[PDB]
Amino acid sequence: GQVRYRNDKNGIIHTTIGKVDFDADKLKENLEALLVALKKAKPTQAKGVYIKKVSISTTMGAGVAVD
RNA sequence: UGAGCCUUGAUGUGUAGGAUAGGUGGGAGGCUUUGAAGUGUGGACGCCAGUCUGCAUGGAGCCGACCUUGAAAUACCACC
What we know:
Keywords: Repressor, Ribonucleoprotein, Ribosomal protein, RNA-binding, rRNA-binding, Translation regulation, tRNA-binding. This protein is mostly helical.
């Protein structure tokens, strides 16, 4: 399920990874694939930290960052 | 008396609208006998039309893509 969403003026961007039906390793590899496909287009005018904190969550989850 | 931090909140009428349209992960039923819609009343907000909570009442429904619409739900959890 390819997804293409846009960032806001503040710079907080998140896209779909899938429902809770996907298991842990699939979720982690999807996160890794999205992370690498996002960092591969790191612009030179993005000086500083590129990925700061991801607020991943579910229907009864809370936004916590990961590695 | 200035400055900051994990957390909980309050405010989000471009005009096309039931009317005070930020959006994203989740998302087409969450939430409500771990008591929801309707009443008198207090403070916050706002584009003086209107939103949230305390108090007592009621104690079982406002809300859905609802009809429109550039962006959809404040149907629900977290972010800013």
